[PDB]
Each structure stands twice: as C-alpha cells, then as structure tokens.
Design a binder for this molecule. Structure first.
Ligand code: HEM
Ligand code: HEM
Ligand SMILES: [Cl-]
Lengths: 179, 178
C-alpha cells in the first residue's frame, strides 16, 4: 500500500551503489544500482528488500518534540549521499517485554540522545519488515551531504558499541549516490 | 509467512456464525460460516487478515501474571468464540509511546481488568493496520458456554474505558465450533 516500500538491487534505479560493507552475518550481493518503489512487487535484479512505515514504538513525547524540532526533510538538494542499512535483531530481543526493550534502547544505549546530536546533518527513515517475514527486521535509510560522511561514520561506530547492538545478529551497509 | 492469518466469511469454514452485532461504525455482512487460514474463493462475503507480532505495551510483571493463568487455545470445552475487529482513530496513532501506554493501562487498566476473566477466556491478538486493512486489530476469544455472561460483562467494562474513546469501528462476530 501507501506505506510499503521496496528496494531492488540490480542494474536500474535512481541510486548508484558506491560500496557494500558486510558488517555482520550474510551480506548482500554487490549490484550497480538500487531502485526504490512505493508499493509491493526484476529481470536483472539480484535482491529485493521491503518494509513498511509504522507507528512509534519507543519514543516518548518529549523525545518526539526534540526530534521534530531539528530533523531535516528528505530529498534535500545537497543530500546526494544515502546509506541503506538492513538490520536483524536476535530472538532474545523479540521475546522481551516492552519495558525491558525500552530500557535497553534508551536508558542503557541512549539511542535517541546519541543520534539526536548528528541532526540536522543526517535525515533518516525507519521501515519495519519482521512482521512481513523478511530476512531482516528493519530497513534504515539515511541521507546527507558529503560533508557529514565522517560524522555519520562516527555515529555508526558509537551505535555499534551500545548495549542495543549486542542483540543485532545481522547488518549490512549499502552506500549510495543519487543520480 | 506463517504469522499471517486470514478470516473468510462465507458458506464454509470450521466455525458457524451465531450472531453479528455491529457495535460502532460500518458492520460486516452476515454470513453462514467463517473459515480460518494460516496464510494470505467464490461465495465469500468478506476477508480479514492480520499477523501475530511482538509485545507493544505489556511490561515484564504483567507478562508473568498473564503467563501464570492464561489458557491455551483449542480447549475441548471452548466451543464458543468471538471475533472482534477494531479500528482506532488517527489521533491514537499520532500519540507517542508513553501517551498510549498511559491510556492503555494507567487510565484504562486494560490488562488488570482482563486478568479477572482468565483462565476462562483464551485470547489472541492480530495486527493489521500496517497491512492497509480496514481494521487495526483482529481480536479472538474462545471460552466454554459457562463464561458467556462473564465475557459480555468484560466487553461493557472495556467499552466504558478511556481507551475506547479512540475506537472508531468495532464489530462482534459470535461463533460456534463445528
Ligand atoms: C542519526 C540519527 C538517528 C536518530 C535521530 C535515531 C532515532 C531513532 C528513534 C527515535 C527510534 C525509535 C523509533 C520508534 O520509537 O518507533 C529509532 C529506531 C531505530 N533506529 Fe535509529 N536513530 C538514528 C540513527 C540510527 C542508525 C545510525 C542506525 C543503524 C545503523 C539506527 C537504527 C535503528 C533501528 C534498527 C531502530 C529500530 C529499533 C527497534 O525498534 O528495535 N538508527 N531511531
Ligand atoms: C479477556 C482478557 C483480556 C486480556 C488478558 C487482555 C490483555 C491484553 C494485553 C496484555 C494487551 C497488550 C498486548 C501488547 O502489549 O502488545 C492487549 C491488547 C489489546 N487488546 Fe486485550 N485483553 C483482554 C480482553 C480484550 C477484549 C475483550 C478486547 C476487545 C473487545 C481486547 C482488545 C485489545 C486490543 C484492540 C488490543 C491492542 C491495543 C493497541 O495495541 O492499541 N482485549 N490485551
Ligand atoms: Cl503482502
């Protein structure tokens, strides 16, 4: 539907693949371009990822207000670089209660506080796909100007050192350049 | 996916429709039976679908209390079932996580009230807003005939809660197991 998005790796698309880092677990086959389509769905395509936009799961009102105060819009003119990061979390994560996951997410890991410092440099989108039976749980999307490449790379090193990332069992970085 | 379930109202299925009460908003056309399929035909009036998902509000202490009393599905005695599709308003979904949790339990005592009716009533929760469905949730309950009066009481207590001020559409589909 309107909230469903598909990412198709192949020879066509609006984004050129700069590199793919297989951070953790099985990776994705290297391709020339990524085609992004609004909806569900590839002759010379190597892989296909899909997720949906959904409601807030963890952020509290005060956190949303801070985010909504500075987060930039998508498709900025200077935002020619983008990074697609599919992520999967362990079964131990999904069996835990809501309060247990909230505490790890922000209290122990400060996911929102840490990321909020890298705005408005980085725009972001979050898509869910575990409920669709996909091989990943989330598709995360970030786009920024080349100036913030080092800053974004620093954020990744920090996030991957948090308690939350002890439950990440698969992760891939797909670096993209807008055409 | 095997977490997906479809409910097909028509002339075939494992459950006979006893009654359909259109509580709030547009209802569902009355049919003869409901067929349940684990996954995603002619002579079918409507199809509803949803998926099982992770916990969204319950805290550990509440999960422990539920797991200590909640019964399993498919009890021999539980020949009655009720399918209640629900849709919540757009104002509900725009709220933050803490705002919705506070309405759900602090103000409405959803879990505390519901616990008073276990182990008599077995339950299942399916999500479908994210699939673009006309409802947000498909809730399933099954129980022996002795608990039908208690279940109607539960419904009235729930619909008087703060949480239900955000329900925009609700239908009751009473079923008997064939
Ligand atoms: C750069 C600024 C960032 C900000 C402001 C930010 C903020 C947030 C917020 C508020 C949520 C919670 C959404 C909700 O409540 O439903 C979230 C979820 C998430 N973020 Fe970020 N984040 C950032 C960067 C990142 C990065 C760099 C990654 C991965 C490399 C990432 C991966 C995730 C994942 C996987 C989730 C979902 C976790 C779950 O639901 O279990 N985020 N982010
Ligand atoms: C009979 C005993 C009941 C118990 C033990 C119970 C318990 C619960 C619990 C713990 C949740 C939270 C699940 C989560 O955190 O993801 C929940 C969600 C829900 N329940 Fe119940 N409940 C009962 C009866 C009912 C009834 C009678 C209805 C409707 C007529 C109902 C409708 C719902 C809905 C719609 C949700 C999802 C709410 C949302 O996510 O916004 N429940 N229930
Ligand atoms: Cl689908």
């Amino acid at each position: 539907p309107n909230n469903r998005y598909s990412f198709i790796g192949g020879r066509t698309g609006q984004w050129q693949v700069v590199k793919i880092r297989n951070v953790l677990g099985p990776g994705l086959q290297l391709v020339e371009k990524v085609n992004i389509l609004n909806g569900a769905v590839p002759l010379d395509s190597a892989w296909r990822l899909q997720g949906f936009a959904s409601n807030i799961r963890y952020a509290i009102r005060t956190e949303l207000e801070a985010l909504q105060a500075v987060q930039p819009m998508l498709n900025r003119a200077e935002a020619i670089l983008a990074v697609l990061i599919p992520i999967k979390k362990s079964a131990q994560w999904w069996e835990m209660a809501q309060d247990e996951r909230r505490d790890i997410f922000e209290r122990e890991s400060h996911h929102t506080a840490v990321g909020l410092e890298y705005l408005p440099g980085v725009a972001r989108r979050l898509l869910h796909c575990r409920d669709l039976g996909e091989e990943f749980d989330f598709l995360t999307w970030f786009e920024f100007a080349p100036e913030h490449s080092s800053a974004f790379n620093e954020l990744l090193l920090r996030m991957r050192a948090s308690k939350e990332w002890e439950y990440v069992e698969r992760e891939v970085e797909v670096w993209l350049k807008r055409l």
